[PDB]
Amino acid sequence: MSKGEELFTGVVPILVELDGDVNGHKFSVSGEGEGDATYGKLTLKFICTTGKLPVPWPTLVTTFVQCFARYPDHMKQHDFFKSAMPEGYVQERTIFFKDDGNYKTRAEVKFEGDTLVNRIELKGIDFKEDGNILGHKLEYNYNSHNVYIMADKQKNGIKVNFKIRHNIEDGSVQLADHYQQNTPIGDGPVLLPDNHYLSTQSALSKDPNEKRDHMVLLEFVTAAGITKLPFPPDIDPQVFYELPEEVQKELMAEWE
Hints:
Ubiquitin-binding motif, DNA polymerase iota, fluorescent protein, replication, UBM, Green Fluorescent Protein, GFP, mainly beta
């Protein structure tokens, strides 16, 4: 269904680089591993290269390559992510942690030679100093989620929405609402899909021999489904909050 699809038939090496700033606390993370879209499997190890990470590792899972999803044969014409390859796509999100701050991310996901690279900038603002995120109150674990995808024909891309459940050490749950958009970097044709979702599962672990602050991440992803107010990635939050609340709400309707 796409030429990009051919780049994913085997095991592909992956590099991830993130520069982050959350409430002015700067950090960098490097990751490496591999993806196997035939199985929908991703395996990655990340190291904080700047010292200790100032937010919980699980808050960064979604930021740290949906081109590795397994699309069933009957759904191959709906796989935007591989169709954009090798030139790649820009993935932008705004992520809202309930009763706490937000992340804004921009990533480029593309081939550099035979390696799939995810290069990310992340800015977080408005976090509470002893809230769940800056206070490191999240459990080191992850649950299963459905990631809902719709075409955005005007932008020649997709919009994506989902809500992550982060378990808190006291037994509560901290929700992270994700508003995502992806657009091709190159000029070649891409597949714009009918509505569907990715069933995503993740598990986090540690390397007992690794003394640097780090995360080992396993994800399994399979497509299915075909037989202060939140602001979107394109609007500076500064301008957004000057709009009437009715308008702020109406601007978010496209994410469903």
